[PDB]
Design a protein around this ligand. Structure first.
Ligand SMILES: OC[C@H]1O[C@@H](O[C@@H]2[C@@H](O)[C@H](O[C@@H]3[C@@H](O)[C@H](n4cc(COCc5ccccn5)nn4)O[C@H](CO)[C@H]3O)O[C@H](CO)[C@H]2O)[C@H](O)[C@@H](O)[C@@H]1O
Length: 435
């Protein structure tokens, strides 16, 4: 049963409960364990472990939240026990598709079969749950004026995740983006993610401008609210909770759900549940695996309890592409033109037919070496100029194998000797069998 969590849908720039027709406001907290790793994943998936999630849900209920943000799940594990238990308390999940070792690399961005496969894996693991509120296609990928060229890759990922869901049998869970709050980039980022032919479904900002006993006017919240007025998709704080002043009073919550902000914003999620030596938690897990409540907890609880946002109904609400920011060197360098959808079968053909292959700092050395001997244009991807090589969507190993093979063919010995000395290099006997 998921009767306490009917699926949430989007209409215009608001979220609505698909049964009641009432506007849905997010009252959230981030929920993610870390470690500080071959046989285990780098990330920990608390939603795959009933002993963890079932400990914490009663405390989450006490806080009064209706949403969690989860940054990483292991798609190979089951999640129904934890998802059902969250549903029984009226709780929804916002979920990042990426994970620390499979994300769009903001300093060398690609949108490729390896990252797309991760995204699909997550979608297929999690889309059966009606309380899955939405997916994030990226978190703070572009984060300042020196890496704006990563943003076309994120937009391609939004497009392709949405299309994969569209063509699947799943409920059409919306796909959005979570951004940081860098002054030089924020307006251009927000416009970029709703410009042209591909749009985010919703937009989360990780918002830390309000610290201590601040006010609507002095925090920056009034000016942010003014700038997002009329933005065409739902907008919310995907993180909040500046810890400059402790214990956090969380008085920003009174502003966020007040009349002035509730007409623009769809709520927000505090960062975060667990205390991890970063002074950001509201509970600390002791050496006996019990929950010890920290001084922030009561303050967040009290603020969420008093929050009573006045929205509008789906029926009363119901009664031209936006231009992409222009390019200026050192300010904004995200091309409107996006990379193509990664093509697993084209790329899988390299695995089959190439004479010389490599099994997955060697990449830098090897690309530098091979790309002085053959033309690597076919694997380059440039988000500034909107020029994406024919094989730029393949995995890094496939890309290196392609270049190695070109060098092998260029030499022309035909003696099965691949021209790079490394234990990971091998001649592919399938290349001999008569893509
Ligand atoms: O694409 C891009 C990149 O993404 C990087 O991975 C992301 C990774 O950096 C991010 O980390 C989260 C992290 O961003 C988030 N978080 C929140 C905070 C609090 O911030 C306070 C604060 C105060 C003031 C101003 C700004 N913030 N600190 N961390 O905490 C989560 C819970 O621990 C983490 O999961 O999780 C994302 C979703 O899984 C990952 O995609 C990736 O490692 C890269 O190579 C890749 O360039």
């Amino acid at each position: 049963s998921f009767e306490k969590t009917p699926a949430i849908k989007i209409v215009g720039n608001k979220f609505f409960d698909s049964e009641s027709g009432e506007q849905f406001f997010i009252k959230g907290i981030a929920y993610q364990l870390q470690r500080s790793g071959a046989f285990e994943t780098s990330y920990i998936d608390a939603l795959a472990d009933p002993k963890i999630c079932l400990r914490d849900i009663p405390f989450l209920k006490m806080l009064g939240v209706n949403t969690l943000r989860v940054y990483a799940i292991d798609p190979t594990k089951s999640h129904d026990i934890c998802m059902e238990a969250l549903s029984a308390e009226g709780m929804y999940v916002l979920l990042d598709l990426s994970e620390p070792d499979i994300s769009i690399n903001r300093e060398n961005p690609s949108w490729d079969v390896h990252i797309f496969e991760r995204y699909k894996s997550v979608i297929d693991a999690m889309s059966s749950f009606p309380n899955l509120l939405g997916y994030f296609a990226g978190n703070e990928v572009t984060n300042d004026h020196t890496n704006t060229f990563a943003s076309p890759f994120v937009k391609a990922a939004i497009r392709d995740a949405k299309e994969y869901i569209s063509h699947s049998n799943h409920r059409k869970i919306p796909v959005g983006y979570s951004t940081n709050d860098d002054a030089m980039t924020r307006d251009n980022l927000a416009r970029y993610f709703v410009c042209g032919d591909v749009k985010a479904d919703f937009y989360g900002i990780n918002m830390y401008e309000w610290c201590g006993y601040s006010t609507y006017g002095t925090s920056g919240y009034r000016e942010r609210t003014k700038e997002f007025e009329g933005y065409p998709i739902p907008v919310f704080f995907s993180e909040f909770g500046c810890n400059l002043v402790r214990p956090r009073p969380f008085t920003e919550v009174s502003a966020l759900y007040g009349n002035k902000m509730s007409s623009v914003w769809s709520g927000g999620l505090a960062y975060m549940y667990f205390e991890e030596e970063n002074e950001y938690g509201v509970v600390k897990i002791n050496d006996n695996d019990g929950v010890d409540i920290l001084p922030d907890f009561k303050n967040l609880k009290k603020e969420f309890a008093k929050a009573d946002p006045k929205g509008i109904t789906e029926e009363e609400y119901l009664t031209e592409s936006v231009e992409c920011p222009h390019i200026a060197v050192g300010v904004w360098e995200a091309n409107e033109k996006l990379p193509e959808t990664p093509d697993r079968s084209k790329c899988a053909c390299l695995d089959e037919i190439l004479p010389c292959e490599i099994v997955p700092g060697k990449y830098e050395e090897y690309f530098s070496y091979l790309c002085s001997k053959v033309d690597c244009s076919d694997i380059l991807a440039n988000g500034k100029t909107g020029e994406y090589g024919e094989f730029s969507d393949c995995s890094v190993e496939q890309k290196l194998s392609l270049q190695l093979s070109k060098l092998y063919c260029k030499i022309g010995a035909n003696d099965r000797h691949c021209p790079l000395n490394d234990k990971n290099v091998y001649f592919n006997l399938e290349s001999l069998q008569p893509c």
